[PDB]
Amino acid sequence: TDNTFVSGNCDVVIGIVNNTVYDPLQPELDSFKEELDKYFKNHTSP
Amino acid sequence: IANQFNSAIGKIQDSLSSTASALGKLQDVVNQNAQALNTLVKQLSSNFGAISSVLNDILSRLDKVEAEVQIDRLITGRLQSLQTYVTQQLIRAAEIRASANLAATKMSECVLGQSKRVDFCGKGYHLMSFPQSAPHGVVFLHVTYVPAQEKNFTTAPAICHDGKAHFPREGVFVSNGTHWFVTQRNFYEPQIITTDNTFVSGNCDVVIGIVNNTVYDPLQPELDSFKEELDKYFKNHTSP
Amino acid sequence: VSMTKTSVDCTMYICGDSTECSNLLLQYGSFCTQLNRALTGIAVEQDKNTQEVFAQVKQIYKTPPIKDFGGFNFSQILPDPSKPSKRSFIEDLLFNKVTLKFNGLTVLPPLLTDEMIAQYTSALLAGTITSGWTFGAGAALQIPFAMQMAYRFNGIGVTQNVLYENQKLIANQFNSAIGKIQDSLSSTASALGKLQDVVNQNAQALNTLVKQLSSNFGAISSVLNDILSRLDKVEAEVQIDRLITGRLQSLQTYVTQQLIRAAEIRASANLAATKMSECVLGQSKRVDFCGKGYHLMSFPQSAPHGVVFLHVTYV
Amino acid sequence: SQSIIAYTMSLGAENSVAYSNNSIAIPTNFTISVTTEILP
Numbered sequence: 160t161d162n163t164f165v166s167g168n169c170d171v172v173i174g175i176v177n178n179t180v181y182d183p184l185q186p187e188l189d190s191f192k193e194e195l196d197k198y199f200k201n202h203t204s205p
Numbered sequence: 206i207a208n209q210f211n212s213a214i215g216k217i218q219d220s221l222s223s224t225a226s227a228l229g230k231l232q233d234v235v236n237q238n239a240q241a242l243n244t245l246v247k248q249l250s251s252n253f254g255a256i257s258s259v260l261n262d263i264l265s266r267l268d269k270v271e272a273e274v275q276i277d278r279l280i281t282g283r284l285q286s287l288q289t290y291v292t293q294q295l296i297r298a299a300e301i302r303a304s305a306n307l308a309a310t311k312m313s314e315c316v317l318g319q320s321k322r323v324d325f326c327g328k329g330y331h332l333m334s335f336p337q338s339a340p341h342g343v344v345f346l347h348v349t350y351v352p353a354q355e356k357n358f359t360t361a362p363a364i365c366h367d368g369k370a371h372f373p374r375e376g377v378f379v380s381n382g383t384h385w386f387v388t389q390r391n392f393y394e395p396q397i398i399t400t401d402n403t404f405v406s407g408n409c410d411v412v413i414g415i416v417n418n419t420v421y422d423p424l425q426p427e428l429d430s431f432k433e434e435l436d437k438y439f440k441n442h443t444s445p
Numbered sequence: 446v447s448m449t450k451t452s453v454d455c456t457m458y459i460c461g462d463s464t465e466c467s468n469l470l471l472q473y474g475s476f477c478t479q480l481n482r483a484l485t486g487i488a489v490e491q492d493k494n495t496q497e498v499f500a501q502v503k504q505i506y507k508t509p510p511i512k513d514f515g516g517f518n519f520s521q522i523l524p525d526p527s528k529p530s531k532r533s534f535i536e537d538l539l540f541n542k543v544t545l546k547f548n549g550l551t552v553l554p555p556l557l558t559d560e561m562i563a564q565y566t567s568a569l570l571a572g573t574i575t576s577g578w579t580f581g582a583g584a585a586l587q588i589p590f591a592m593q594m595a596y597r598f599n600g601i602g603v604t605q606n607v608l609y610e611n612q613k614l615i616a617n618q619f620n621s622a623i624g625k626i627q628d629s630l631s632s633t634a635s636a637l638g639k640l641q642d643v644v645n646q647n648a649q650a651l652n653t654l655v656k657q658l659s660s661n662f663g664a665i666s667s668v669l670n671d672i673l674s675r676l677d678k679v680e681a682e683v684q685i686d687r688l689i690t691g692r693l694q695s696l697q698t699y700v701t702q703q704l705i706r707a708a709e710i711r712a713s714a715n716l717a718a719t720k721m722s723e724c725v726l727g728q729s730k731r732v733d734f735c736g737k738g739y740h741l742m743s744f745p746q747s748a749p750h751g752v753v754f755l756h757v758t759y760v
Numbered sequence: 761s762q763s764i765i766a767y768t769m770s771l772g773a774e775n776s777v778a779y780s781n782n783s784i785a786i787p788t789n790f791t792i793s794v795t796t797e798i799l800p
C-alpha cells in the first residue's frame with residue numbers, strides 16, 4: 160500500500176489480475192497485539 | 206514574490222522609457238528595408254555607359270536608331286539593379302521567416318506553456334512569459350525564478366541506520382555541521398530525516414560516502430505512547 | 446558555427462592598377478558599395494554566431510585543483526596547462542583534423558581568438574562539472590559530481606539509488622566512452638567532415654572568384670594593359686567594359702553565393718547555441734536533441750570554425 | 761583627458777567554484793527576474 164494507489168473496483172479494468180497487497184501497518188500492529196497479549200498473560204499471575 | 210514581480214515590471218518600463226537603443230533588432234530591419242529602396246532609387250542616376258541616365262535626354266536627342274543602343278544600356282543596368290534588390294530581399298526574407306518561426310515557437314512554449322528548455326524563455330528557471338507587440342515584431346517579457354542567497358552545507362548520498370541505506374524521495378541530505386536534514390534541491394527548507402522523506406535500498410556496504418544518522422519513524426512514538434497507555438492500564442489493573 | 450570573414454576591394458578586383466577602368470566603373474554608381482555592405486553584414490554576424498554559442502557563461506568558472514569527482518575522469522576534456530593555448534586533449538585532436546591579395550580580396554580575423562573560444566569552453570566545462578545546471582539559471586552552486594549525476598538519473602526517470610550502487614561502473618563506462626572518443630577522432634579522417642566542407646567551400650569560392658579574371662568575357666584580352674596598349678580610347682573602352690560587365694557579374698555571383706551560404710551557417714550557429722543552452726547548461730527531455738539514448742549531460746569542445754558536443758546518455 | 765584606448769577583451773570575471781566530494785550549496789532565498797526578449 161506504499162508503492163500503489165487505489166481507485167475504483169476491479170471489474171472496470173480490462174486485464175486486472177489477483178495478487179495480495181501487503182500493508183506494513185498490519186504487522187506493526189499485530190506485533191503490538193502480541194505486546195498486548197503477553198502483558199495480559201503476565202498479569203494473570205498477580 | 207508579488208512585490209518582486211511588480212518591481213521587475215517597473216524596471217522594464219524604466220529601461221524602455223530611458224534608453225534610445227533597446228529595440229535595435231527591429232530598427233535594423235526598418236533600416237535594412239529603407240536602405241535597399243534608397244540604393245535602388247540611386248541606381249536610376251547611373252549611366253551604365255549610355256550618353257545620359259535619363260531616357261528623355263536620349264529620346265529628345267538621338268533618333269530611334271541611335272537611341273536604342275543607349276536605351277538598351279539603361280535597360281541592362283536597371284534590370285540587374287532590380288534583380289539585385291529582389292535577390293537581396295529573397296535572402297533577407299528567409300532571415301525574417303526564421304525569426305518569425307522562432308517567435309511563433311516562443312509564443313507556443315513560453316506564453317501558452319511553461320518551458321523546461323534551458324535559456325529558451327529567459328535566463329533562469331522559466332515560470333511564464335507575457336507577449337507585447339512592437340513595429341513589425343514581438344517582445345516577450347520572460348518571468349523566471351533565480352535562486353539568490355546560497356549557504357554551504359556538508360552533504361551525503363545516503364544515510365545509514367539499521368545497517369540499511371536510506372536515500373531522499375525528493376530532495377537532498379544536508380548538514381549544518383552537527384545535525385542532519387533532508388531538504389528540497391532548489392530552496393533551503395530542512396526537515397528531520399523521516400521514513401516518509403526517504404526510501405531504503407540495500408545495506409551500508411555498497412554506497413561510496415554514506416554517513417551514519419538516525420532515520421525517524423513517526424509510527425513508533427504513536428505506538429510507544431500507546432505502550433505507555435497499555436502499561437498504566439496494567440498498573441491501575443494491579444490494584445484489585 | 447562560423448565561416449571565414451571576407452571583404453573585397455571591388456575597384457581593385459574589377460580594375461586593379463587601371464585609372465581608365467576605374468573611371469568607367471563610376472558609370473554603374475553604387476554597384477560596388479552595396480557588395481561591400483553585403484560582405485560586411487556577413488562578417489559582423491560570424492562574430493555574433495560565435496558569441497551566441499560560446500559566451501553563454503556569466504563568469505569564467507575554474508575547476509578545483511583536487512579532482513574528487515568520485516570516479517568520473519574528465520582529464521581528457523579539461524584544459525591542459527602545458528600548452529601556449531589551454532585547450533583540452535580532445536580539442537587539440539579537433540584542431541588537427543580540420544586543415545585550412547593582388548586581386549583586392551582579403552580575409553578578416555574573427556573577434557574572438559581560438560584562445561578566447563577555449564576559455565569560454567573551459568568555463569562552461571568547469572561550471573558544468575562543479576555546479577550542474579545551476580550556473581545556467583543563477584550563480585554557480587557547488588554540488589558533488591556523483592550526487593549531481595544522481596539528479597541526472599532522476600531526470601531520466603531512473604531512481605537515484607541505482608546510480609550510487611553502480612557509481613564505479615557508471616564512472617568506468619564514462620571513462621571508457623571518453624577513451625573511445627579520442628581513438629575515433631585520432632584514427633578516423635571523415636569525423637570532422639562538416640567543418641572541413643565549410644573551409645573547402647570558402648576556398649573553392651575564392652579560387653573561382655580569382656580564376657574569373659583570366660576570362661575574356663568576349664573582349665580581345667583578359668589583360669587591361671593589352672587592351673589599352675593595342676586599341677585607341679574609343680575602341681579600348683569597349684573591351685575594358687566587356688571585362689567590367691563580366692567581372693562585376695563574377696563579384697555579384699560570389700557575394701550572392703556567400704549570402705546564401707551565410708544563412709546556412711547562421712542556422713547552424715543558432716542550432717549550436719540552442720544545444721549549448723539546452724544540452725550543456727541543462728538536461729534535455731527532447732528526444733534525439735542531445736544524442737541517442739536518454740540525454741544526461743553534454744560537454745562542449747571547440748573546433749576550427751565550429752563546436753563539438755560530447756553528449757552523454759543512458760542507454 | 762579623454763582618448764581612444766585599445767585592449768584585449770575580457771571574457772568575464774574569473775570564478776573558482778568551491779567543489780568538494782561532500783559540499784553542496786543550496787539557495788536560502790530567490791529573486792523573480794523579468795527580462796525582455798525582442799524578435800523580428
Ligand SMILES: *[C@@H]1O[C@H](CO)[C@@H](O[C@@H]2O[C@H](CO)[C@@H](O[C@H]3O[C@H](CO)[C@@H](O)[C@H](O)[C@@H]3O)[C@H](O)[C@H]2NC(C)=O)[C@H](O)[C@H]1NC(C)=O
Nearest residue numbers: 166167168169170171172173174175176177178179180181
Ligand atoms: C480473482 O478474484 C475474483 C474476486 O474474488 C474472483 O472472483 C470470484 O470467483 C469465485 C470462483 O468462481 C466466485 O465464487 C463463486 O461465486 C460465484 C458468484 O459470485 C458463482 O458463480 C460460483 O458459485 C463461484 O464459485 C466468487 O463469487 C467471485 N468473486 C467475485 C467478487 O466475483 C476470481 O475468480 C479470481 N480470479 C482468479 C483467476 O483467481
Ligand SMILES: *[C@@H]1O[C@H](CO)[C@@H](O[C@@H]2O[C@H](CO)[C@@H](O[C@H]3O[C@H](CO)[C@@H](O)[C@H](O)[C@@H]3O)[C@H](O)[C@H]2NC(C)=O)[C@H](O)[C@H]1NC(C)=O
Nearest residue numbers: 357358359379380381382383384385386387395396397398
Ligand atoms: C543544527 O540545527 C539543529 C536543529 O535546529 C540545531 O540543534 C538545536 O540547537 C538549539 C540551540 O542552537 C537547541 O535549542 C536549545 O538551546 C536553546 C539555547 O539555550 C534553548 O532554546 C533551549 O535550551 C533548547 O533546548 C535545539 O534543541 C537543538 N535542536 C536539536 C534538533 O537538537 C543545531 O544547534 C545546529 N547546529 C549548528 C548550528 O551547526
Ligand SMILES: *[C@@H]1O[C@H](CO)[C@@H](O[C@@H]2O[C@H](CO)[C@@H](O[C@H]3O[C@H](CO)[C@@H](O)[C@H](O)[C@@H]3O)[C@H](O)[C@H]2NC(C)=O)[C@H](O)[C@H]1NC(C)=O
Nearest residue numbers: 361364365366367368369408409410414415416417418419
Ligand atoms: C557507522 O556505523 C558503522 C556500523 O556500526 C560503524 O562500524 C562499526 O565500527 C565499530 C568501531 O570500530 C566496530 O566495533 C568493533 O568492531 C571492529 C570490527 O568490525 C573491531 O575492529 C573493533 O572491535 C571495533 O571496536 C563495529 O564492528 C563496526 N560495525 C560494522 C558492522 O561495521 C562505523 O564505525 C560508523 N561510523 C561512524 C561515522 O562512526
Ligand SMILES: *[C@@H]1O[C@H](CO[C@@H]2O[C@@H](C)[C@@H](O)[C@@H](O)[C@@H]2O)[C@@H](O[C@@H]2O[C@H](CO)[C@@H](O)[C@H](O)[C@H]2NC(C)=O)[C@H](O)[C@H]1NC(C)=O
Nearest residue numbers: 354355356357358382587776777778779780783784785786
Ligand atoms: C563556501 O566555502 C568556501 C570554501 O570553503 C570554506 O572555507 C572556510 C572559509 C569555511 O567556510 C569552511 O567551512 C569551508 O570549507 C568559502 O570560501 C571562503 O571565502 C572566505 C570569504 O567569504 C575566504 O576568507 C576564505 O579564504 C574562503 N575559503 C576558501 C578555502 O576558499 C565560501 O565563502 C563559502 N560560501 C558561502 C556561501 O558560505
Ligand SMILES: *[C@@H]1O[C@H](CO)[C@@H](O[C@@H]2O[C@H](CO)[C@@H](O)[C@H](O)[C@H]2NC(C)=O)[C@H](O)[C@H]1NC(C)=O
Nearest residue numbers: 206207208209210212353354788789790791792
Ligand atoms: C529574500 O530576498 C528578498 C528579495 O528577493 C528580500 O526582500 C526584500 O527585503 C528588503 C529589506 O531587507 C525590502 O526593502 C525589499 O523591498 C524586499 N524585496 C522586495 C522586492 O520587496 C528578503 O529580505 C530576502 N530575505 C532574506 C532572509 O534575506
Ligand SMILES: *[C@@H]1O[C@H](CO)[C@@H](O[C@@H]2O[C@H](CO)[C@@H](O)[C@H](O)[C@H]2NC(C)=O)[C@H](O)[C@H]1NC(C)=O
Nearest residue numbers: 512515516517518519520521522534620623624
Ligand atoms: C584519468 O585519465 C588520465 C588520461 O586522461 C589517466 O592518465 C594516464 O594514466 C596512465 C596510467 O598511469 C598513463 O600511462 C598515461 O600516460 C596517462 N595519460 C595522461 C594523458 O595523463 C589517469 O590515470 C586517469 N585517472 C584515473 C582516475 O584513473
Ligand SMILES: *[C@@H]1O[C@H](CO)[C@@H](O[C@@H]2O[C@H](CO)[C@@H](O)[C@H](O)[C@H]2NC(C)=O)[C@H](O)[C@H]1NC(C)=O
Nearest residue numbers: 611612613614615616617618619620621622760
Ligand atoms: C551490467 O553491465 C555492465 C557493463 O555495462 C557489466 O559490468 C562489467 O562486468 C564485467 C564482468 O562481468 C567487468 O569485466 C567489466 O569491467 C564491467 N564493466 C565495466 C565498464 O567496468 C555488469 O557485469 C553487468 N551486470 C550484469 C548483471 O550483467
Ligand SMILES: *[C@@H]1O[C@H](CO)[C@@H](O)[C@H](O)[C@H]1NC(C)=O
Nearest residue numbers: 170171172173174175176177
Ligand atoms: C489476451 O489474449 C488472450 C489470447 O492470447 C485472450 O484470451 C485474453 O482474453 C486477452 N486478454 C486481454 C486483456 O485482452
Ligand SMILES: *[C@@H]1O[C@H](CO)[C@@H](O)[C@H](O)[C@H]1NC(C)=O
Nearest residue numbers: 197198200201202205439443
Ligand atoms: C510481568 O510484569 C512485571 C511487572 O508487573 C515485570 O516486573 C515482570 O518482569 C513481568 N514478567 C514477564 C513474564 O514479562
Ligand SMILES: *[C@@H]1O[C@H](CO)[C@@H](O)[C@H](O)[C@H]1NC(C)=O
Nearest residue numbers: 413414415511513780781782
Ligand atoms: C573525500 O576526499 C578526501 C580526500 O580529499 C578523502 O579522504 C575522503 O574519504 C573523501 N570522501 C568521500 C565522500 O569519499
Ligand SMILES: *[C@@H]1O[C@H](CO)[C@@H](O)[C@H](O)[C@H]1NC(C)=O
Nearest residue numbers: 437438439440441442443444
Ligand atoms: C483506573 O482506570 C479506570 C478505567 O479503566 C478509571 O475509571 C479509574 O479512574 C482509574 N483509577 C486510577 C486510580 O487510576
